[PDB]
């Protein structure tokens, strides 16, 4: 086990900004529907991204 | 002085005076003190008296 990516702050977005957040490799999100190897989606406003 | 939150900054209040008003440009989409709902840069006036 190797520390990968060292200890960093969380990523929050301010209310009139987005994160264009694309799928590296294929997964499935949390509420489980599907998302390809590729797909793009926009992280929305305010709020925080995991 | 809690650990979870920060002064950004400290805000002096505008003083305004009779016959004058004060030129307000929201940050982000949001309300104001009246109730009109004021998107992203656009620009309103309040001509309220005081400070």
Redesign the interface.
């Known amino acids: 086990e190797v520390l990968e990516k060292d200890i960093t702050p969380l990523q929050v977005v301010?209310?009139?900004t987005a994160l264009h957040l694309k799928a590296l490799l294929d997964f499935e999100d949390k509420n489980g529907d599907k998302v390809m190897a590729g797909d793009e989606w926009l992280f929305e406003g305010?709020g925080t991204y995991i | 002085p809690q650990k979870e939150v920060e002064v950004v900054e400290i805000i002096q209040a505008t003083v305004i005076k009779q016959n004058q008003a004060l030129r307000l440009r929201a940050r982000k989409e949001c309300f104001d003190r009246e109730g009109k709902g004021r998107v992203t840069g656009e620009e309103w006036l309040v001509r309220s008296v005081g400070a």
Do not use: K, S, T
């Open positions: 301010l209310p009139n305010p």
